[PDB]
Design a protein around this ligand. Structure first.
Ligand SMILES: CC(=O)N[C@H]1[C@H]([C@H](O)[C@H](O)CO)O[C@@](O)(C(=O)O)C[C@@H]1O
Ligand SMILES: *[C@@H]1O[C@H](CO)[C@@H](O)[C@H](O)[C@H]1NC(C)=O
Ligand SMILES: *[C@@H]1O[C@H](CO)[C@@H](O)[C@H](O)[C@H]1NC(C)=O
Lengths: 172, 319
């Protein structure tokens, strides 16, 4: 995608994350955890279901049209009828081909983008207490128990609590 | 200073290939097929009103051939015409066949209104043995065969019906084509014969044709059928020094014509679906279908491709 997160600086996806599209995976003194991020997940799902709804329910309500199958050829009038239908079919075939290609190119970009927005959100919460490792992971330069990790995930983490400890560790 | 928090995304073992602008093989976590390539083996009679012509094609239904009585009074969204329909009457041709077929189909109903034409010295209700409606020689029940007097007199006949009604009428009439000059005057006065149906806008004129025509029918002659539409405030005049397969009335025309015809051998079933192809009904929410270009109702759009997968998930990169 355009942002280079999915199939980019995030090397791969997580099969074990089964209740979200995006999430957190941590490691602290007392263990490891994998939790889903609802907001990011929901943002991606809403945008994709949106595409689906706009698509499913066209309106193509047609009754009396033209003859489209013929036993024997008749010449001029029949040729026009066949040419008209054949032109219609190619134009609609082209439309469907382009549509799916555009939609899929965009869907991939949206999902890559939502991944990046999650990463950038967490980067900003951390301020000067963490450093980007380069694989979608932050090294946190202070002791961070389970309540601390959770405070990061639910967005209540207050960087000022740990900044002294963190600045010390980073630069000394 | 070494706890670590990692941001990531989901994945599954095996995803689905989709196309983009740049790549025709990208694996995403989920995808949705947009081309319907499955149909039901039957036609759904709901919610669209389908009328099964069975043994009658729609032209024979309107003429009133033997075995087409079930089509009387019938109203349809889609007339379902069978590929193995059978001619069961006096052999005919319709000069603008596809155009008459189109008008009947689009009109959507068989509502015949009888009115009687005071014909002169001539006999009425002539019948035939190639049109044997149940056990006896008969004719198209909407048409009336006129033949000589008991005194070899067929006077020039000019009758007229006036449309003061609030709808346009459809009159279907015919012209007989004998094989010989003796067959020609054996059931009719002159040679040549002729029919001339006029409105105040139009005039249509036919003189019969006499000759060796090929035989099954068991017979050598034919009828050529024509129609005239008489708008509210218009008139129709039948003149004939011979050969007229005269009408017994007129069909009611809807002002709005929104029906159509579908030609297929598919049986009508019990399902529900507003979309019919000649291969059978479709029951789908998909936007496209590759089943048949012949499609009627509320349908997906026909396309050439057999599959178009829409990505509904992110790229799948497992492990
Ligand atoms: C006299 C008449 O109007 N109908 C007779 C017709 C016509 O003479 C021919 O159809 C004209 O070509 O001939 C029949 O053999 C037939 O076809 O069954 C008997 C029938 O009673
Ligand atoms: C017969 O023709 C005459 C003159 O052509 C016309 O005035 C008359 O109204 C016609 N009668 C009928 C019954 O059509
Ligand atoms: C429609 O596509 C399917 C595959 O999805 C294929 O099997 C079938 O032959 C196609 N039908 C036509 C009429 O091409």
């Amino acid at each position: 995608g355009l942002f280079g997160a999915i199939a980019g600086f995030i090397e791969n996806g997580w099969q074990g994350l089964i209740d979200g599209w995006y999430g957190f995976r941590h490691q602290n003194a007392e263990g490891t955890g994998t939790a889903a991020d609802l907001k990011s997940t929901q943002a991606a799902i809403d945008q994709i279901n949106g595409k689906l709804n706009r698509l499913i329910e066209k309106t193509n309500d047609k009754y009396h049209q033209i003859e489209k199958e013929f036993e024997q050829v008749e010449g001029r009038i029949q040729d026009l009828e066949k040419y008209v239908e054949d032109t219609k079919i190619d134009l609609w075939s082209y439309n469907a081909e382009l549509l799916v290609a555009l939609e899929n190119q965009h869907t991939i970009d949206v999902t890559d983008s939502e991944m990046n927005k999650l990463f950038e959100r967490v980067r900003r919460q951390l301020r000067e207490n963490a450093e980007d490792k380069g694989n979608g992971c932050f090294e946190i330069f202070h002791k961070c128990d389970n309540n601390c990790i959770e405070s990061i995930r639910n967005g209540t983490y207050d960087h000022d609590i740990y900044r002294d400890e963190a600045i010390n560790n980073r630069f000394q | 200073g070494n706890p670590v928090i990692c941001m990531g995304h989901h994945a599954v073992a095996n995803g689905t290939m989709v196309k983009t602008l740049a790549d025709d093989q990208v694996e995403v976590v989920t995808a949705q097929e947009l081309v319907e390539s499955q149909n039901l083996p039957e036609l759904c009679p709901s919610p669209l009103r389908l009328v099964d012509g069975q043994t009658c094609d729609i032209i024979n239904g309107a003429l009133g051939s033997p075995g087409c009585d079930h089509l009387n009074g019938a109203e349809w969204d889609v007339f379902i015409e069978r590929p193995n329909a059978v001619d069961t009457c006096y052999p005919f041709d319709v000069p603008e066949y596809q155009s008459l077929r189109s008008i009947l189909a689009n009109n959507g109903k068989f509502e015949f209104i009888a009115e009687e034409f005071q014909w002169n010295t001539v006999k009425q209700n002539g019948k035939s043995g190639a049109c044997k409606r149940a056990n006896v020689n008969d004719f198209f029940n909407r048409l009336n065969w006129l033949v000589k007097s008991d005194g070899n007199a067929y006077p020039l006949q000019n009758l007229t019906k006036i449309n003061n009604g609030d709808y346009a009428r459809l009159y279907i009439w015919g012209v007989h084509h004998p094989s010989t000059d003796t067959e020609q005057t054996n059931l009719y006065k002159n040679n040549p014969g002729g029919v001339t149906v006029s409105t105040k806008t139009s005039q249509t004129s036919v003189v019969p044709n006499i000759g060796s025509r090929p035989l099954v029918r068991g017979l050598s002659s034919r009828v050529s059928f024509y129609w005239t539409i008489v708008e509210p405030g218009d008139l129709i005049v039948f003149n004939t020094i011979g050969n007229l397969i005269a009408p017994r009335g007129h069909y009611k025309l809807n002002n709005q014509k929104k029906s159509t015809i579908l030609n297929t051998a598919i049986p009508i079933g019990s399902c529900v679906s507003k979309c019919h192809t000649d291969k059978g009904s479709l029951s789908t929410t998909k936007p496209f279908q590759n089943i048949s270009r012949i499609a009627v109702g509320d349908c997906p759009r026909y396309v050439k491709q057999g599959s178009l997968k829409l990505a509904t998930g992110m790229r799948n990169i497992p492990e």
